[PDB]
Amino acid sequence: AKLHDYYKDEVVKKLMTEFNYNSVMQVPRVEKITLNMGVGEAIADKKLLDNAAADLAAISGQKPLITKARKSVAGFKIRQGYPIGCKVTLRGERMWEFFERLITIAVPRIRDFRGLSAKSFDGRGNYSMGVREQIIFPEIDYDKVDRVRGLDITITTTAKSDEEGRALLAAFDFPFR
Amino acid sequence: DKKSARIRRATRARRKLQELGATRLVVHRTPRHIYAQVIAPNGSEVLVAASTVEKAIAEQLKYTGNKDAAAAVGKAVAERALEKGIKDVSFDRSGFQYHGRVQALADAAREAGLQF
Amino acid sequence: GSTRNGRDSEAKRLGVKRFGGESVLAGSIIVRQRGTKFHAGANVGCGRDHTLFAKADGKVKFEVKGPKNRKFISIEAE
Amino acid sequence: MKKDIHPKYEEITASCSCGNVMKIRSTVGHDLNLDVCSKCHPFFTGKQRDVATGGRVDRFNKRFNI
Amino acid sequence: GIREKIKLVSSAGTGHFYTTTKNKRTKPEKLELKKFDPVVRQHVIYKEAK
Amino acid sequence: GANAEAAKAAGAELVGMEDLADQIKKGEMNFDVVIASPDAMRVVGQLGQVLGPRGLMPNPKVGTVTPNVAEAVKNAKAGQVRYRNDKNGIIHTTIGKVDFDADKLKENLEALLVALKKAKPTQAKGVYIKKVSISTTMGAGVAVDQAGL
Amino acid sequence: MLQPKRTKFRKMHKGRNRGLAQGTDVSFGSFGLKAVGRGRLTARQIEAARRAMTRAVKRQGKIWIRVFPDKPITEKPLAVRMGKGKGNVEYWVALIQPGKVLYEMDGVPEELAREAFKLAAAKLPIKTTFVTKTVM
Amino acid sequence: MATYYSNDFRAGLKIMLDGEPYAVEASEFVKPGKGQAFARVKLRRLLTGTRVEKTFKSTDSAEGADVVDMNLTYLYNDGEFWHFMNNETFEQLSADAKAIGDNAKWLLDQAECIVTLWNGQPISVTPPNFVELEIVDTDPGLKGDTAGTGGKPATLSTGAVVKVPLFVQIGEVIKVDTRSGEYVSRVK
RNA sequence: CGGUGAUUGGCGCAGCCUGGUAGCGCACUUCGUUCGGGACGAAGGGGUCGGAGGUUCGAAUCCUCUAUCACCGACCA
RNA sequence: UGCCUGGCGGCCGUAGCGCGGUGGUCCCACCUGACCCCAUGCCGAACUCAGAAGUGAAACGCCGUAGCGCCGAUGGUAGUGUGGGGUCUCCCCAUGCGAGAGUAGGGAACUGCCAGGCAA
RNA sequence: UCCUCCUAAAGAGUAACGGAGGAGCACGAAGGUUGGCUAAUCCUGGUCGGACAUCAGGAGGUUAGUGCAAUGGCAUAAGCCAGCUUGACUGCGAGCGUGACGGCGCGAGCAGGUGCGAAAGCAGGUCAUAGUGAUCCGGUGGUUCUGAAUGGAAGGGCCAUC
RNA sequence: CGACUUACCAACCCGAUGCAAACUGCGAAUACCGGAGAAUGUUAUCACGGGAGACACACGGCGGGUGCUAACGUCCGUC
RNA sequence: CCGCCG
RNA sequence: UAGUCCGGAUUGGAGUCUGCAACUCGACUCCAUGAAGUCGGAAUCGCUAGUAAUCGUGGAUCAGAAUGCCACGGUGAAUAC
């Protein structure tokens, strides 16, 4: 948690004069980072979900939760309660050490990088990026993979506007094309 | 919501409990000051109330709001219950998990002599 | 021509058997009903068919309680 | 956190070409050798060579030679 | 129809039996319930028979 | 699913999938029993077709081969199961144990196969059920058993 | 022929036509065609009294029809005995109590609106009258 | 028990009278003024099936058969018999040479040939619309003179004989149909 | 009038029964053969189930209303 | 006794939302830490535990506001019990009961038992 | 024959070849208990990924769900999930409900023996209401209750059942 | 690879408007069950026992189904 | 063996 | 032993040459790109000797612009019952 000790008095201080809060509990703090890997093609192989969940066990630090299908749709041929993804809700201590590991040495490994979008906010302060490979994370051996598919990182904060959570990310410098 | 999710969690064993006319022991945990009181079977008047917000309890404890400060409540509720002739009660979790401080308040009540 | 209807069932004889203040000996069925249209209250039990049976040789009395106003059936004790 | 179900989370020591030795916790294993990090990456010098690309009259007047 | 009827025979000394049903062609493992035996006045294990 | 690592606690050696279909194509004699699940009911019924029932090692809804509760299945079927199998003629030869056990219990181990063979037949039996029965050792013993007692 | 779209049930009971009306005041328009008699109007009769009323007011102006049928009328065929089921639906009526403003009109003068509802009311089986939008 | 009356059944309703199962192909139900009702039923024998014509009255008619026609997978042959497997439930099934009749050629292996099972046992086997097979005994068909369709016969791997054109020799795996028995094309 | 079963590729017919695919023979398309057409050999394409309304996660299939094409009836006086 | 507050009710929208303001010594809420008690079909987020640096932001309580929900007359209308009547698929008279909708209007709940705080 | 709604006229009941639909089961968990949890559908943001899979947030409020038709019911949830489990237990049963009768339904409590829960307590199947057939004859198991001179047995009876 | 002009169809909401046996955020009259009390009525009430007959109904009013808001039609309710 | 006609 | 250091199409850029002129519409180079393609269905053609096959060179037409045509040598078969 390098960039939590950084957060406690150089980003909290930074956002109290940008949006002139009267109370330190008004400052946007980040709550959780949820890593969905929407595998989709676990209809063919169940062990195709097992390699994909094994890649979240490396990109994150902990074992993923496989996600059942809420409804059942015949446009994709999935039944009710048939496993169709895997999520990692990392929060607390390991989400700071991931967010350190995300923006510093995993964003530069993205092939043909220009910047992250300044419009990938859902009107509440919650960012969502989506990567197209596993191999932007060094925890992949580059040889044990057999599928291109990446994941999407969602950063749920306690912000309120799209600007108020943009400015929280922008103090971690979070490149923003 | 944190609060009203627990009220409906508790209501199943409140309405069932007043259907038996039971003089009930109502515990109320908070991150400081676990509370406890004993309520008559009408539901409308109480008989015994002892808790660590009282100044005759908190002076003898270093922190009010841990397990041994919860065992100081359940002994004092049972010491005041037997004066009124209240032997038989029914414990009410009030939506709290019967695990930590609210177990010790029922432990120290069953140790001191509050029969249930 | 022909018809496709003409089918019904033995009327189940539901409803309230014992009304308001009308002494009922314990175990006396009061309301025979589909679901819990009328809910069980003081001294009155509810069966496996939502038949609220009396439990104490007394009166009856319907009410409305809580924040849902569900006719409720209690038993005054005389 | 649970026992025995999670992968090992031993702290590593990263290193990129710029001398940026930076200790992080990960699950890689032994060590880690990097190309670029958030420091020394072509995001601030990269758009410097993106603005001045287009233009054709200055292309032509080098074939004018005067 | 499909769900045939079996006969749980008591594993006590007597021959009291409960009778019930079981769909055999979906869950063909035998029933090992623990029911009350009114000859022994105990609560011994019953086992499926025909 | 989980049963690719669950019956690994049930003692079986090569737990898996079509890795054992490469071994059918090589013709390996290291196993005697093929047990599957309704997950794995699409493999040997489609890939190892002849070579699973020529030597006979399949499973369906007749033998107890393929439930989905394979954890507590193989906690005993690794130990003592001896597969009562057809022959073209009258014969159904089963196997007695090592000679140096408690031999009086073996006279129940031969007897507690009777109540399972007489438990359910083909509802089309002929004159007798059990005509001739002789419990040989391997090559030398002869003991005429009775079908009645 | 004004007819409902995808009704709940095909055949309904006969029912009585008792009571007073609800379309009493002229709401949408300036001049109305109010019923005095108790009858019922079929969908052919609404639509025939509309063609005889749109025509007189040559199409400019605006006309509101305050009644819709939404009631099916069954009919036993000829040479068929009683029983053996309800008849099949042939046409759709609207039930008219006394006081029901049937049609309305706006955008024409007071005399052309007068002299068009009379040509429309000759197509109706009920006795109607002429009413004007009243304040309050 | 499933008893049927002859004014009821439409087509395909499998019935069981005089010791044999019958499929109904079609039935025309007539009844005329001042007569009773009869149904001139065009049945089909199921075990030895050629055809049969019965003209039932309005009463009575026959019990039904346990007659399931589900998809089975041909996978095995031994001596006489031919074993099959369901791809839905994986239950065993054993067919005989009287049940295979006049179709022992057309299966090769892993074929989804349907069977009709009667009363818990199969008597018929229907091989698919096409199977691909291999020619093992065919002359190396030379043109020679031939001006006018040459058509040489080919003995196949399964002991069938088919008429093939003059460009398939041996190991030229060719697919045929089973309903007639003609060459259609060559698989490559 | 009703009573009963079908309307699936340009044509005619299977599939439905028991829900997860739309095939078959002709033709038509290209090539080859031929002095050319016909025959013949090779490659290939084209329907999405008469229409409507549901049931179901999902309908050519199961359901109801229909459509106009077949068949069978239209008794006793 | 008077304010604030917390548990348990009485009642059940005149009591519910919206909008504007407001409170931290008490209490309460977030908050702090979690190796453990216990805990996550992954995650102390929740549950649980150990504590008290910070803030009243959220939430909660209180206050103000009718912008909606809700309450709501009197009069009339509809209906109808009984008895007569008519130009009798509908209505009328005598008598008794008499809505629903809408209108004026009210209205930002009230209240009991205990405990804590603070002023008397 | 059975179940649901309407006709049915606000107690119950109520007919027609009146208007609409369903049943001839399923389940050893889909039953019991304890502990928790809250839907449908749109909206934005997001790798493959679209009208629609999974993730996140919001609006929304039970328009969802309920093994299966319809009605009544359901937040204390009867709906969803997890652990332990066999009360889907034997002998009775005050008291009513409903049928012309055969019958059918509800049932606190009592004794014995269990389960779950710290406990108060709940549990003699399932949200309720369809999922079904009387006798006679006969089959199997149990119980010395009778047992044609007596002793057995056979056959009857009772009990469980087919 | 993209759109420009755009005589027209029109969901969710908002305002107004009707309809329903199988619609209800509302809701009578009567009828019904039960309790108290007075007058009145040859116990008119109930239970048991002997004997029956009857189980083809008709019209009229009201509330309806059905039919044509046809029938001295038909089918229930109640007098 | 097959081989139609302009 | 791979669509690979195979194959070179297609295409972006930068040029040279000829000619009044290189957009329609040239050849050539350079850098980048790196496609189909894994020996070809029915059918079909050429060749019996310095031949087939394979490898390069030259000329004519012509400012420039050939894989064609016309000529020249290198290596050099198999088979004919």
CATH number of the domain at G93, please: 3.90.1170.10
CA distances G18 to A159, G38, G44, G98, G99, Å, are 63, 9, 23, 10, 12
Rounded CA-CA distance A176/A163 in Å is 13
On the CB side of H102, CA atoms within 13 Å amount to 6
Backbone conformation region of residue B33, classed left if phi is above 0, alpha if psi is from -120 to 50, else beta:
left
Rounded CA-CA distance A167/A165 in Å is 5
Rounded CA-CA distance F68/H101 in Å is 38
Backbone angles phi, psi at F141, to 5 degrees: -75, 145
- Show the tokens assigned to E11: 């594993």
Rounded CA-CA distance F91/F114 in Å is 14
On the CB side of A70, CA atoms within 13 Å amount to 0
Backbone angles phi, psi at D21, to 5 degrees: -80, 120
Q: Is the peptide bond before F32 cis (omega within 30 degrees of 0)?
A: no
Checking each nucleotide's C1' against the CA of B69, the nearest proves to be J50
Write out the E strands in H19-139.
20-30, 38-45, 52-57, 63-64, 73-77, 82-85, 92-95, 114-117, 122-126, 130-133, 135-137
Between CA D50 and C1' N17 the distance (Å) reads 36
Q: List strands edge to edge, sheet with H15-17.
A: H52-57, H38-45, H20-30, H15-17, H63-64
Write a three-state SS string for chain F: CCHHHHCCCCCCCCCCCCHHHHHHHHCCCCCCCCCCCCCHHHCCCCCCCCCCCCCCCCCCCCCCCCCCCHHHHHHHHCCCCCCCCCCCCCCCCCCCCCCCCCHHHHHHHCCCCHHHHCCCCCCCCCCCCCCCEECCCCCCCCCEECCCC
Beta-bridge partners for H163: H153
Helix, strand, coil percentages (3-state) for chain G, rounded to 5, are 20, 25, 55
Looking up tokens 């779209």, which residue turns up? G5
D16 is in an annotated binding site: yes
Question: Residue F136: which residues within 8 A CB-CB, separation 6 or more?
Answer: F142, F143
- Show the tokens assigned to D5: 């179900």
Q: List strands edge to edge, sheet with C29-32.
A: C15-16, C29-32, C52-54, C44-46
- Show the tokens assigned to A69: 């299908």
Amino acid at F105: L
Rounded CA-CA distance A103/H171 in Å is 62
Looking up tokens 């088919």, which residue turns up? H162
Chains G and B touch (3+ CB pairs under 8 A): no
Backbone conformation region of residue A111, classed left if phi is above 0, alpha if psi is from -120 to 50, else beta:
beta
Residue E25's closest chain F neighbor by CA? F61
Q: Give the closest residue to H160 by CA, choosing from H76, H102, H84, H75.
A: H102
Asked if A46 is an interface residue toward chain F (Cβ–Cβ < 8 A), one would say yes
Q: How many CB atoms lie within 10 A of CB A92?
A: 12
DSSP string computed for C43-78: TEEE-TTS-EEE-SSB---EE--TTTT--EE-----
Rounded CA-CA distance H137/H155 in Å is 5
**Total domain count, chain A:** 1
Nucleotides of K under 7 A from a protein CB: 2-8, 11-22, 24-29, 35-38, 40-41, 44-58, 71-78, 85-91, 94-99, 105-108, 112-114, 118-121, 125-129, 141-142, 160-162
Fill in the DSSP letter of residue H132: E
- Show the tokens assigned to H73: 């997978």
Contact H138, H157 (CB under 8 A): no
**By three-state DSSP, how is residue H27 classified?**
strand
Rounded CA-CA distance C71/H128 in Å is 69
In our burial notation (b when 16+ CB lie closer than 10 A, e otherwise), range G7-32 reads: eeeeeeeeeeeeeebebeebeebbbb
Beta-bridge partners for E17: E9
Contact H151, H138 (CB under 8 A): no
**Total domain count, chain G:** 1
Alpha carbon of residue G83 to chain centroid: 31
**By three-state DSSP, how is residue G96 classified?**
strand
Question: Residue A138: which residues within 8 A CB-CB, separation 6 or more?
Answer: A105, A106, A109, D26, D28, D32, D34
Alpha carbon of residue C42 to chain centroid: 13
D59 Cβ within 7 A of any nucleic strand N atom: yes
Q: Which domain holds residue A162?
A: 1-177
Looking up tokens 């990446």, which residue turns up? A150
Alpha carbon of residue H54 to chain centroid: 23
Contact B66, B58 (CB under 8 A): no
Backbone angles phi, psi at D59, to 5 degrees: -65, -45
Chain length of chain F: 149
Q: Which residues of A touch D (CB under 8 A)?
A: 2, 57-58, 61-63, 94, 97, 100-101, 103-105, 107-109, 113-115, 138-139, 173, 175
Question: Residue A65: which residues within 8 A CB-CB, separation 6 or more?
Answer: A86, A87, A88, A89
Rounded CA-CA distance B94/B15 in Å is 12
Question: For the purposes of burial, counting CB atoms within 10 Å of the CB of H3, is it exposed (0-12), middle (13-18) or buried (19 or more)?
Answer: exposed
**Total domain count, chain B:** 1
Contact E8, E47 (CB under 8 A): yes
Q: How far is E19 from chain F (nearest CA, A)?
A: 19
CA distances C74 to A51, C23, C41, C46, F133, Å, are 62, 12, 5, 11, 77
Chain length of chain C: 78
Alpha carbon of residue C69 to chain centroid: 16
Asked if G85 is an interface residue toward chain C (Cβ–Cβ < 8 A), one would say yes
In our burial notation (b when 16+ CB lie closer than 10 A, e otherwise), range B46-71 reads: ebbebbbeeeebbeeeeebbbbebbb
Q: How many CB atoms lie within 10 A of CB F88?
A: 6
DSSP string computed for A152-169: EEEEEES--SHHHHHHHH
Q: List strands edge to edge, sheet with G72-75.
A: G39-42, G88-96, G72-75
Cα-based torsion angle of the residue sequence B10, B11, B14, B20 in order, rounded to the nearest 10 degrees: -140
User: Looking at chain G, which subunits does it touch, using at least 3 CB pairs closer than 8 Å as the criterion?
Assistant: C
Rounded CA-CA distance C6/C8 in Å is 7
Angle between helices B101-112 and B67-81 (to 10 degrees): 40
Chain length of chain D: 66
Question: Residue G60: which residues within 8 A CB-CB, separation 6 or more?
Answer: G107
Backbone angles phi, psi at H38, to 5 degrees: -140, 150
Contact A130, A151 (CB under 8 A): yes
Question: Residue G36: which residues within 8 A CB-CB, separation 6 or more?
Answer: G98, G99, G126, G127, G128, G129
- Experimental technique for the deposited model: cryo-EM
Fill in the DSSP letter of residue A69: -
Rounded CA-CA distance F113/F125 in Å is 18
Chains G and C touch (3+ CB pairs under 8 A): yes
Rounded CA-CA distance F114/F51 in Å is 31
Q: Which domain holds residue G34?
A: 21-136
Write out the E strands in chain E.
4-10, 17-22, 46-49
Backbone angles phi, psi at F69, to 5 degrees: -120, 40
Asked, for residue G15, whether it belongs to a domain, the answer is: no
Looking up tokens 């179900």, which residue turns up? D5
- Show the tokens assigned to A114: 């220009």
Contact H25, H44 (CB under 8 A): yes
Q: What angle do CA H143, H144, H150 make, to 5 degrees?
A: 40
Asked if F64 is an interface residue toward chain E (Cβ–Cβ < 8 A), one would say yes
Alpha carbon of residue H30 to chain centroid: 32
- Show the tokens assigned to D14: 């990263």
User: Looking at chain C, which subunits does it touch, using at least 3 CB pairs closer than 8 Å as the criterion?
Assistant: G
Helix, strand, coil percentages (3-state) for chain C, rounded to 5, are 0, 25, 75
Rounded CA-CA distance D61/H182 in Å is 78
**By three-state DSSP, how is residue A132 classified?**
coil
**By three-state DSSP, how is residue G33 classified?**
strand
Contact G41, G124 (CB under 8 A): yes
In a mutational test of the E interface, the residue from F59, F61, F120, F123 whose CB has the highest number of chain E CBs within 10 Å is F61
Looking up tokens 């009920």, which residue turns up? G126
CATH number of the domain at B49, please: 3.30.420.100
Rounded CA-CA distance H77/H97 in Å is 11
Beta-bridge partners for H161: H155
Rounded CA-CA distance H60/H62 in Å is 7
Query: Which stretches of H56-122 are DSSP H helices?
Result: 97-100
Beta-bridge partners for G25: none
CA distances F116 to C47, D47, E15, E30, F133, Å, are 47, 82, 20, 14, 16
Checking each nucleotide's C1' against the CA of H143, the nearest proves to be M2
Backbone conformation region of residue A173, classed left if phi is above 0, alpha if psi is from -120 to 50, else beta:
left
DSSP string computed for chain D: --SSSSPP--EEEEE-TTS-EEEEE-SS-S----S--SSS-TTSSTTHHHHS---SHHHHTTTT--
- Show the tokens assigned to H29: 């139900």
Backbone conformation region of residue H34, classed left if phi is above 0, alpha if psi is from -120 to 50, else beta:
left
Rounded CA-CA distance E44/A46 in Å is 43
DSSP string computed for B26-83: EEE--SS--EEEEE-TTSS-EEEE--TTSHHHHTT-S-SSSHHHHHHHHHHHHHHHTT
Rounded CA-CA distance B79/B83 in Å is 7
Rounded CA-CA distance H170/H135 in Å is 5
Between CA B41 and C1' J7 the distance (Å) reads 16
Bridge pairing between strands C72-73 and C62-63: antiparallel
Backbone angles phi, psi at H177, to 5 degrees: -100, 155
Interrupted backbone of chain F, residues before each interruption (C–N > 2.5 Å): none
CATH topology of domain E1-50: Rubrerythrin, domain 2 (2.20.28)
**By three-state DSSP, how is residue B106 classified?**
helix
Contact G41, G125 (CB under 8 A): yes
Q: What angle do CA B23, B28, B34 make, to 5 degrees?
A: 120
Asked, for residue G125, whether it belongs to a domain, the answer is: yes
Rounded CA-CA distance H31/H33 in Å is 7
Fill in the DSSP letter of residue B24: E
Rounded CA-CA distance H99/H117 in Å is 10
Bridge pairing between strands B24-28 and A151-157: unpaired
Question: Residue H137: which residues within 8 A CB-CB, separation 6 or more?
Answer: H154, H155, H170
Element (H, E) at G46: helix G43-54
Between CA C75 and C1' I44 the distance (Å) reads 87
Rounded CA-CA distance F72/F91 in Å is 32
Rounded CA-CA distance G135/G114 in Å is 19
Domain boundaries, chain E: 1-50
CA distances D66 to A161, D55, D59, Å, are 57, 18, 13
Angle between helices G110-121 and G43-54 (to 10 degrees): 140
Alpha-carbon Rg of chain E, whole angstroms?
A: 11
Q: Which residues touch strand M (CB under 7 A)?
A: H 144-150
Residues in chain D with CB shorter than 8 Å from the CB of A105 are: 14, 16, 22, 24, 34, 37-38
Element (H, E) at C15: strand C15-16
Q: Which domain holds residue B21?
A: 1-116
Torsion sign over Cα A136, A140, A141, A147: negative
Checking each nucleotide's C1' against the CA of B66, the nearest proves to be J50
Element (H, E) at A57: helix A47-59
Q: Give the closest residue to D3 by CA, choosing from F21, A63, H69.
A: A63
Nucleotides of N under 7 A from a protein CB: 14-15, 41-43
Alpha-carbon Rg of chain C, whole angstroms?
A: 16
Rounded CA-CA distance A159/A148 in Å is 33
Q: Give the closest residue to H182 by CA, choosing from H160, H150, H149, H159.
A: H160
Between CA E18 and C1' J74 the distance (Å) reads 74
Rounded CA-CA distance A137/E46 in Å is 59
Asked if C1 is an interface residue toward chain G (Cβ–Cβ < 8 A), one would say yes
